[PDB]
Design a binder for this molecule. Structure first.
Ligand SMILES: Nc1ncnc2c1ncn2[C@@H]1O[C@H](COP(=O)(O)OP(=O)(O)O)[C@@H](O)[C@H]1O
Lengths: 141, 155, 286, 152, 52, 194, 67, 50, 279, 94
């Protein structure tokens, strides 16, 4: 996990050369585990992960600023990346071809207080199977 | 209590006493009171069994009409006293939190039933059972369903 | 003149039995007597009943007879045994009311100034109504309408007599008409509540339809004065749900966290305790 | 008195000085009126005391009628400018007479207390029970009038 | 020091005053019940009886 | 846990154990500063007469403690750096990159931006030191860390905070704890049926 | 109806009442006896059978001294 | 438990301080409200059990 | 059907109950309660309520016609009034008293136990005093130290009032001592202050006259409660008396109360100090 | 006619209904509140008047079909939702 820790730091930072070196150093075990094809995929999706974190960080971030932050050096590539992030639905960052506007959040609506209970009311479903297992597992002799 | 008996003359006792005749019906649920036993009444002859004329056109009339709750099941009562009731419910179950806490560190390794009998506390697992929590849960959902049912009626 | 009346669960069955016992030879379908009780705080209550044989003829509804001397002797005996009891009104069966009621009310009002009429449905049990109350108001039908009888219904609610709970519980002892089985009982409470709402509102819709057809006289002067507000009251605006998006949904989600989870945890605790006991018993049995 | 006491009329004192201001110039006796308003120094002080008195009266009656009123209209109704209207509006609220909240940048006011969701659903339930009672009363009324109307 | 109820919107040069509803203490009380009824029981009991 | 059992000013010796009573106080001040920003700490440590006396003994220690209490960031950051430098010369240096100055300013920035909605980066920079870019990069780093509940409008250089209501923030806490306990009960569901 | 003095109010519906001679009982107003106006030390009428207070009563005036 | 409540409607059991245990299944007993009350002995306890 | 039956049997009257003070829970399903009129009879304890509020000698609630244990009242002070929690209220702080000291060093010695120091009572091997009797006239106030001290170190203060205690409530006199002791035991920072002992409460030179035996029994139970205290917690008990000659030796003997303090007349130099403080 | 269906009584709608000027709307709605025609909130940013009536009058009994249709609409909605919740509750009521 020490190179994995450095991989996590590289993912957060967004740099490329540093982790490419350590992959060349200790990437053989990753090949043995069978994730080296994914490892390269993370190496080139590091910018995607950085965009999500910085998009969660900022309200209206400049397309030039995000390009400089994640080493894009191109306004068009930055516009494409945020285009590719919104179409994946991972983040809510939108595009305004004027300067790159992104909407903010809003107050809590009808279903925003109800989506936890809707996704968590399976508690009784666990309760019923626990009771049913007890039904199966209370043999007296 | 509606107990009926008969006074007897002196001849019934000198003959075969217990004037209760030869049958196995008045011996059903025949428990005369201790003060009745030491008095002659309810002891001289017998205790009379009681029955109620629960005939139909009379009993169906009583149950249908007297105990009347027919459109009163549509009450909503979302938070008339329930916001503070939920505050009390949380506080009571916070006490259950401490009680169900107290239990998990008792939890001794000597057949905990042995510990439980001599250290009863009437905690959430023992006496303040899940049924009380069910009562709180039923109260919440009933107000929920009533409010939601009328919400979709509101069209 | 009374604001409202409240009927006890004390006289309804007595009237029905009186109908049954005097209907053996009198098949007029018309049972007429007096209801006795008390009126203290604009709330009228009935505590005793009595039936008198009573015959009718359809000719102008003016053929009848009663036993007034016996009925008056009953009232004196009832007042002697219980002073607070007084004749609060006179009752007649046969909800299809005829025209002799005005003559009966005029004769009996010497016992009660605000004479009232009561109809008991011995055989009918339509939805839950045991009886209906009637107040005599002939002080002009309306502002611009001709003269009429216009016997109106003073609001009636079934009261809660004391010391009869013991008897009724012992009597039935089979249905248990209480909130017992809270979840299932409230489901039944929701069921017949919807049944009552659907039946009564359908009756109101039928009345509006029949008013539209005009086959019956239209009492619109009170119908629209009472139903217009009912219709226009803004219970359909959903923006107050928008303002109260968390009307209680916060309490809904805590109950999910703190009733369903708690039930799951305590059930889980019971099972794992049983599983430990069963595993130990299996391993240490021999 | 009949005009200026009740029914929440717009007490535009500019109109009142000629509609009901005749007591200043000539009335039946006009001797108390000249003592009150016909005086020079104390009369003009009482004139100003009538001028404001109708302003709080106009604010108070507007409170129970209009929830949100634009700043220009309220100032015109108070016969003053924006700053003078807001100054008196501040004078009422510091006395707890009215429940008023103003957005000074937007120049918009509100007089309704924010309805807590607890009591908001309570009045909804009370509205529901009022409807339920109306159903019961209408059902008894129509069914019995149905019984009278089919006695044929 | 929580003596006032508002937020200072310097961008608009204003301060938005909001009437905070304090009846929402059920929220925090519920969380405390969650914390002191679950953490103290599930970890301790089911780590002691790891084998079942 | 440190502070709750360490504000007790009952020393076994007048000047021993932790090298002094003055060093005992400096540990108290550092631990308290990591602990909390500004609740009624005026009635917890400031009301402490022995506390006020020892800050009279140490003016520099009194300087930043009052600077945090007065929320004057112009002197706070300079004094906060001096605090970090002093902690460097101390063997109790374990929070070398977590809780010297970053955690305290996280409390300070949270204290500052709360009761605010949109405070400009340029003016908050001069009110909190100098180097508008330095504060801008500091805010971006700390927002990425997770705290400082706000967002930056870079195209207009504004700090638009997002403070949840008492209902909203607390409801967020419940759904987080709901996530943890669902993870717990699922683990317990694994414990059963095996 | 037996007469006592309510020592204290157990709950909103439970009231601890001392019989002037015998033991303290507790009673409870049924529906409309205005439990708010009842105070610790008030005078109420009780019945060993009806289980409740049927009506409330003010105080005394030292009659021998009064006349 | 309901039957226990109905039994306790008759005060249930009465506390007595046993003093003298006579041979003919008789114990004098002392009761706080009144005092001595000579009575028989229950079936579950013998004469010597007193 | 059986969930319905289980919800059917739980009626238990659900009706206005009564109070007969509980004596002690002998076992489960068996109990001994004492009704207020005496009539101590054994009852059956339901499983609904138990040790969670079933403290040995606290006032409890019982069915009206059944007298069965249903509920227990937590509060004990308001059962017979006799003052209540005078804590959390500065009436006369401490140094603002005009009486200066008289001694006030044995009183500060008395407040040492409320002022923690019970841990310092051990280790150091001291046996701290438990009962302080002040056999002084109304000079120095004789309650300005009890109204203070309770606020100097935050502690509950109860007036008790001995004259009120001796009344028809002689049967519940033992019960009220148990209740007030439980209130004291509930709050370790508390002090019991009893007044007017000399004239009425268990005078020893004058023969018993009617209800005097009842007063002696009440003192006997108060002695029982103070012996049951046995330094379990840090509560303190102080009686204020004008003359301790008539007091019973049971309280006067060491081992129950030891510290005797006399508060003399205004002490002219102190009297001028009292006037200056009051003025 | 509109049971809160159109609860936005804008100035233009008021102008259509009463052919009155803008300044007279304030007096007209004032007298409406006094008599009892409309008792709802009166705004001016959007000029919205909330709709409550407590003084009913003749509803043109020849046009009773409108209220009959609305009432039967309520009947259909209530019965449909009652059947829907019954469908969701066959696992308890059946
Ligand atoms: N500063 C003070 N110093 C001394 N006595 C005071 C002071 N302030 C008030 N007092 C008096 O002390 C009195 C206490 O009286 P009381 O309690 O009846 O005496 P005892 O406690 O002996 O029965 C009060 O009446 C009050 O007037």
């Amino acid at each position: 996990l020490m190179p994995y820790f450095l991989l996590t730091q590289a993912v957060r930072t967004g740099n490329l050369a540093k982790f490419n070196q350590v992959l060349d150093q200790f990437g053989e075990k990753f090949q043995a585990d069978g994730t080296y094809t994914l490892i390269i995929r993370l190496r080139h999706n590091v910018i995607k992960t950085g965009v999500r974190m910085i998009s969660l960080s900022y309200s209206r971030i400049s397309l030039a600023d995000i390009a400089q932050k994640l080493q894009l050096d191109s306004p068009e590539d930055a516009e494409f990346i945020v285009a590719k992030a919104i179409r994946d639905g991972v983040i809510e960052a939108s595009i305004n071809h004027e300067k790159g506007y992104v909407q903010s959040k809003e107050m809590i609506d009808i279903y925003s207080t109800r989506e936890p209970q809707l996704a968590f009311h399976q508690r009784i479903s666990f309760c019923l199977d626990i009771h049913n297992m007890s039904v199966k597992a209370m043999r007296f002799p | 209590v509606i107990d009926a008996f008969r006074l007897i003359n002196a001849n019934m006792m000198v003959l075969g006493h217990e004037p209760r005749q030869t049958t196995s019906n008045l011996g059903h649920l025949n428990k005369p009171s201790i003060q009745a036993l030491i008095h002659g009444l309810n002891r001289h002859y017998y205790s009379i069994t009681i029955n109620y004329r629960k005939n139909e056109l009379e009993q169906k009339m009583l149950l249908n009409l007297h105990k009347k709750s027919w459109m009163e099941g549509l009450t909503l009562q979302d938070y008339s006293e329930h916001c503070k009731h939920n505050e009390s419910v949380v506080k009571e179950m916070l006490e259950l939190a401490k009680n169900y806490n107290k239990a998990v560190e008792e939890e001794d390794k000597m057949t905990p039933e042995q510990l439980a009998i001599k250290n009863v506390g009437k905690q959430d697992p023992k006496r303040h059972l899940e049924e009380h929590v069910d009562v709180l849960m039923t109260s919440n959902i009933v107000q929920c369903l009533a409010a939601m049912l009328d919400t979709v009626v509101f069209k | 003149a009374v604001q409202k009346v409240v009927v006890h669960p004390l006289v309804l069955l007595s009237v029905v039995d009186h109908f049954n016992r005097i209907g053996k030879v009198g098949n007029q379908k018309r049972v007429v007597g007096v209801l006795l009780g008390s009126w203290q705080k604009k709330v009228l209550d009935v505590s005793n009943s009595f039936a008198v044989p009573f015959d009718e003829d359809d000719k102008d509804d003016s053929v009848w007879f009663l036993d007034h001397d016996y009925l008056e002797n009953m009232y004196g005996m009832f007042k002697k045994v219980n002073a607070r009891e007084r004749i609060v009104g006179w009752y007649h069966t046969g909800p299809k009311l005829h025209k002799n009621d005005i003559a009966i009310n005029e004769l009996m009002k010497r016992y009660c100034p605000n004479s009232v009429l009561v109809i008991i449905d011995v055989k009918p049990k339509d939805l839950g109504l045991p009886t209906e109350a009637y107040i005599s108001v002939e002080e002009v039908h309306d502002d611009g309408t001709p003269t009429s009888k216009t016997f109106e219904h003073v609001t009636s609610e079934i009261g809660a007599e004391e010391a009869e709970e013991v008897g009724v519980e012992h009597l039935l002892r089979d249905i248990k008409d209480t909130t017992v089985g809270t979840l299932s009982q409230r489901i039944t409470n929701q069921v017949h509540g919807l049944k009552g709402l659907n039946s009564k509102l359908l009756d109101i819709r039928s009345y509006l339809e029949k008013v539209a057809t005009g086959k019956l006289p239209i009492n619109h002067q009170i119908i629209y004065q009472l139903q217009d507000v009912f219709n226009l009251l803004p219970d359909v605006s959903l923006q107050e749900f928008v303002k109260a998006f968390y009307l209680k949904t916060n309490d809904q989600m805590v109950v999910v966290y703190l009733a369903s989870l708690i039930r799951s945890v305590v059930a889980l605790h019971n099972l794992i305790n049983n599983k430990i006991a069963n595993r130990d018993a299996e391993k240490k049995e021999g | 008195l009949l005009k200026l006491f009740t029914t929440m009329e717009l007490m535009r004192w500019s109109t009142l000085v000629e509609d009901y201001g005749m007591e200043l110039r000539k009335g039946s006796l006009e001797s108390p009126a000249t003592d009150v308003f016909g005086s020079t120094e104390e009369g003009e002080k009482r004139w100003k005391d009538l001028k404001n008195r109708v302003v709080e009266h106009n604010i108070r009656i507007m409170a129970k009628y209009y929830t949100r009123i634009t700043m220009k209209r309220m100032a015109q109704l108070l016969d003053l400018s924006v700053d003078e209207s807001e100054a008196f509006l501040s004078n009422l609220v510091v006395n707890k007479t009215i429940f008023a909240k103003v957005d000074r940048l937007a120049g918009i006011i509100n007089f309704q207390r924010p309805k807590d969701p607890n009591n908001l659903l309570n009045d909804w339930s009370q509205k529901l029970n009022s409807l339920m009672s109306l159903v019961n009363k209408t059902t008894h009324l129509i069914a019995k009038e149905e019984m009278i109307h089919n006695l044929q | 020091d929580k003596k006032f109820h508002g937020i200072l919107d310097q961008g608009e040069g204003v301060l938005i005053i909001f009437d905070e509803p304090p009846v929402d203490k059920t929220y925090e009380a519920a969380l405390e019940t969650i914390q002191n009824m679950s953490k103290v029981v599930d970890s301790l009991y089911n780590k002691a009886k790891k084998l079942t | 846990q440190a502070a709750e059992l360490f504000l007790d000013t009952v020393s076994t010796f007048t000047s021993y154990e932790l090298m002094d009573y003055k060093t005992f106080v400096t540990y108290t001040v550092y631990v308290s500063m990591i602990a909390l920003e500004r609740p009624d700490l005026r009635e917890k440590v400031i009301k402490g007469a022995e506390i006020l006396e020892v800050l009279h003994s140490l003016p520099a220690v009194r300087q930043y403690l009052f600077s945090l209490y007065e929320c004057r960031y112009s002197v706070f950051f300079q004094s906060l750096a001096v605090v970090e430098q002093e902690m460097k010369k101390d063997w109790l240096f374990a929070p070398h990159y977590r809780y010297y100055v970053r955690e305290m300013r996280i409390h300070a920035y949270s204290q500052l931006l709360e009761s605010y909605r949109s405070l400009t980066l340029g003016y908050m920079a001069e009110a909190f030191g100098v180097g508008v870019e330095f504060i801008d990069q500091e805010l971006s780093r700390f927002i990425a860390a997770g705290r400082l509940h706000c967002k930056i409008d870079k195209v207009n250089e504004i700090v638009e905070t997002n403070r949840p209501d008492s209902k909203n923030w607390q409801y967020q806490e419940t759904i987080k704890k709901g996530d943890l306990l669902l993870n717990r009960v699922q683990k317990l569901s694994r414990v059963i049926n095996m | 109806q037996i007469v006592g003095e309510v020592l204290k109010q157990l709950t909103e519906e439970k009231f601890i009442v001392k019989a002037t001679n015998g033991p303290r009982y507790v009673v409870g107003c049924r529906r409309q006896l205005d439990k708010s106006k009842l105070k610790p030390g008030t005078r109420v009428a009780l019945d060993m059978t009806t289980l409740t207070i049927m009506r409330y009563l003010p105080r005394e005036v030292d009659p021998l001294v009064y006349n | 438990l309901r039957e226990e409540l109905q039994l306790l409607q008759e005060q249930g059991s009465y506390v007595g301080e046993v003093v003298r245990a006579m041979d003919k299944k008789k114990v004098l007993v002392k009761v706080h409200p009144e005092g001595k009350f000579v009575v028989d002995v229950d079936k579950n306890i013998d004469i010597n059990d007193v | 059907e059986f969930l319905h039956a289980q919800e059917e049997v739980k009626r238990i009257q659900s009706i206005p109950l009564v109070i007969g003070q509980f004596l002690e829970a002998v076992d489960q399903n068996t109990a001994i309660v004492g009704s207020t009129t005496g009539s101590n009879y054994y009852v059956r304890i339901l499983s609904t309520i138990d040790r969670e509020l079933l403290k040995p000698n606290a006032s409890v609630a019982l069915h009206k016609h059944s007298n069965a244990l249903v509920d227990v009242l937590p509060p004990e002070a308001d059962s017979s009034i006799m003052m209540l929690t005078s804590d959390q209220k500065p009436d006369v702080m401490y140094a603002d008293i005009g009486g200066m000291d008289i001694q006030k060093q044995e009183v500060r010695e008395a407040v040492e136990l409320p002022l923690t120091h019970f841990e310092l009572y051990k280790q150091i091997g001291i046996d701290p005093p438990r009962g302080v009797l002040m056999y002084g006239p109304p000079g120095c106030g004789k309650t300005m130290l009890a109204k203070a001290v309770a606020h100097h170190t935050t502690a509950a203060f109860i007036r008790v009032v001995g004259s009120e205690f001796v009344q028809k409530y002689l049967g519940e006199g033992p019960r009220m001592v148990r209740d007030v002791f439980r209130l004291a035991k509930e709050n370790a920072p508390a002090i019991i202050f009893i007044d007017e002992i000399d004239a009425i409460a268990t005078k020893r030179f004058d023969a018993q006259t009617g209800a005097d035996r009842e007063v002696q029994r009440i003192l006997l139970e108060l002695l029982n409660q103070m012996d049951g205290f046995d330094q379990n917690v840090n509560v303190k008990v102080i009686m204020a008396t004008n003359r301790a000659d008539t007091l019973d030796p049971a309280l006067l003997r060491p081992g129950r109360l030891d510290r005797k303090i006399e508060f003399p007349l205004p002490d002219r130099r102190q009297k001028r100090l009292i006037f200056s403080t009051i003025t | 006619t509109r049971p809160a269906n159109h609860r936005q009584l804008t100035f233009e709608e008021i102008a259509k209904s009463a052919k009155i000027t803008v300044n007279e709307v304030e007096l007209l709605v004032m007298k409406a509140l006094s008599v009892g025609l409309v008792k709802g909130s009166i705004d001016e940013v959007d000029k919205r008047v909330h709709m409550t009536w407590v003084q009913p009058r003749v509803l043109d009994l020849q046009q009773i079909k409108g209220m009959k249709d609305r009432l039967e609409f309520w009947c259909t909605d209530v019965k449909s939702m009652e059947m829907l919740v019954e469908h969701q509750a066959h696992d308890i009521l059946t």
